[PDB]
Amino acid sequence: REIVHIQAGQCGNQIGAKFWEVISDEHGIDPTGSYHGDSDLQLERINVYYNEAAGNKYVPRAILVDLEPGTMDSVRSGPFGQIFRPDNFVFGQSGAGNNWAKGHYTEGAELVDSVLDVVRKESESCDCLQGFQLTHSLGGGTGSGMGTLLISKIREEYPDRIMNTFSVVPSPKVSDTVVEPYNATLSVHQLVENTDETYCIDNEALYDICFRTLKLTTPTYGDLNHLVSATMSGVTTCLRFPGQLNADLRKLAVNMVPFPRLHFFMPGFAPLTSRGSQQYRALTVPELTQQMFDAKNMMAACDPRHGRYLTVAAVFRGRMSMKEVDEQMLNVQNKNSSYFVEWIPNNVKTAVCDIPPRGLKMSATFIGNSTAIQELFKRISEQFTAMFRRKAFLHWYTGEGMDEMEFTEAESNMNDLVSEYQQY
């Protein structure tokens, strides 16, 4: 099987560097080097993310889409930056304006064809394609607009292969941009109707989870990114490993989406202990479920405790008892019968790889489909209206060839999306 990552925008891009920083080491691939793999198993399934050309050069099969040179020229001028074949860099030296409209209708719409071109060169690579990974932020141009287009096109070209989306939904407390809800509401809209698996991460849900669950005092972006990339590795790549009970994107999809919206999840990693001290090793297993299922530790902003779950997928990856795994999951399902929805006898989807995260003994990625994420699109949707009402920075959209009915559309859509989620 296979997949083809997609680094839309700067963020989605910045993260690319971290997702690939990791993944590679979790596959023994040095900058341009080959497979130094401490083992021999980190190779029989690599294909999922690379391509064979030289014999020591397995190049990441991702796409780097962005209308701001400097960015990709920071990712390509640093560490692992020199592993992507230049063909991968689909830049847009234009003015990468922070407008969803500027990267979806006017500026991005041009650079698109020169992207799809490659997304096809990579898809028609070889073997059988599974789906595409998509990273970006719903709070900018090259991210929400242009990346949200990249998919609307992808999903017309292969309505068969899957589409996981890793979105950095606009954090609450403080917005790292101003129109944010504009660029956001507009991209979520596109999401709820193309990709079929979205993993929403919040820069501040991370800080928290990174400053109190990792006594880490100076959580640089690199970190946040790093933590995130840690989860997306547990998801995909991981399951493309052996296991007593293994799954793969689809299983994950076909066990997690009760209703076609696409629904968005909230990823959570397992061993999340501070370096030295904490290295408690309390990782027998009840310790991992202890972790994963708590409020804090959910990369999302919202707290599960604020709304039932529809599905859950503990994708563990480290030798354990299909008994102490299958078992724990249960008590968990009974101690919290309250929030776990009932019309699904077994919400949880236990998954079990074998080999764990390179240096760790036992981990377990969590992919929750809780109704709690209602209280986020609400947020976003609110911010919109409060500012839409006055058409705040709307001239930067319309003046870019947009519509007063376009914004209406999205909000409603994504706004209805809130509604539905409550229906459960």
Binding site: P260, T408, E409, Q423
Partner: protein, 317 residues
């Protein structure tokens, strides 16, 4: 309220002794027996019920309400050889063998010119199919997708759908002939008509009150659901069997939730598919909806008829 009406088609002499025999036992005028089944639902039309009779119970009221500026939906379902073609249109000019759409067209133009002295009517017809979940206009078939936009209330409608004036019955027939000639039909034997594309025929009754400039706009959606089939296996067949299986199943599933929500359950899967955006004006506001289900004896028809039975039956029980 949504009402479910079963229509059995009769067998012809050539098939009474070929292989197709009765499986439908009728009791009274509202129960149909099949293996195990002690009550059905609201009404079962027997294999002795006229086209005219089906039209009175199912569409006559809906047409009346549409002329006062309300919405109405008539859904149609039934598999291959169940009698769908015979009920909805029949033969285009037949004095009593004609269907639903030619009768509505006759009743519309019998009020027009007999009751127009302050009303200025414009009957606009639009005909589109949903094929591979893309809206294909059937008045120009170089169109392979067509979009929705939203009205004044934020309710979606199909913008750009080619509409045309019709002011006598003939022009309505000409729109049907045009749309059917590009409908996706599987090449079977000449008798069978295997619909792989769901059809939405829109009759938009626009009437203008010329004295006050008040406009009314009743929408009659005649929705031909191809429906979910007793067909063969797929996984090494490159037919439009696999492609149809995905369309018919996605739309029938959305079906299930929509009656369940009509007979009660908080708002839910609107704006999910193009069908459910087209019929948005028809569903949830002041509307009426009739689902006409067909299914002949020929043993396979038992499959789709049981499908139409369960669409009904879950809700009222």
């Amino acid at each position: 309220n949504i009402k479910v009406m079963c229509r059995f088609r009769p067998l012809n002499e050539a098939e009474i002794l070929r292989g197709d025999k009765f499986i439908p036992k009728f009791k009274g005028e509202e129960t149909v027996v099949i293996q195990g089944k002690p009550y059905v639902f609201d009404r079962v039309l027997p294999p002795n019920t006229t086209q005219e009779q089906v039209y009175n119970a199912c569409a006559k009221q809906i047409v009346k309400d549409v002329l006062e500026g309300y919405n109405g939906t008539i859904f149609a379902y039934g598999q291959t050889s169940s009698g769908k073609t015979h009920t909805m249109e029949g033969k285009l000019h037949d004095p009593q063998l004609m269907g639903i759409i030619p009768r509505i067209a006759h009743d519309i133009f019998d009020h027009i010119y007999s009751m127009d002295e302050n009303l200025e009517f414009a009957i606009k017809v639009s005909y589109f199919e949903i094929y591979l979940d893309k809206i294909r206009d059937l008045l120009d078939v170089s169109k392979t997708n067509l979009a929705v936009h939203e009205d004044k209330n934020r309710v979606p409608y199909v913008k750009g759908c080619t509409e045309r004036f019709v002011s006598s019955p003939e022009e309505v027939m000409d729109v049907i002939d045009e749309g059917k000639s590009n409908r996706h039909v599987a090449v079977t034997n000449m008798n069978e008509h295997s619909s792989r594309s769901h059809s939405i025929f829109l009759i938009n009754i626009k009437q203008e009150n010329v004295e006050t400039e008040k406009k009314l706009s009743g929408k009659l959606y005649l929705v031909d659901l191809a429906g979910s089939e007793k067909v063969s296996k797929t996984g090494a067949e490159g037919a439009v069997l696999d492609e149809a299986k995905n369309i018919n199943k996605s739309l029938s599933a959305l079906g299930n939730v929509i009656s369940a929500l009509a007979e009660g359950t908080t708002h839910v899967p609107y704006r999910d598919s193009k069908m459910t955006r087209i019929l948005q004006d028809s569903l949830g506001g002041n509307c009426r909806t009739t689902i006409v289900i067909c299914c002949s004896p020929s043993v396979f028809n038992e499959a789709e008829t049981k499908s139409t039975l369960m669409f009904g039956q879950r809700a009222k029980s």
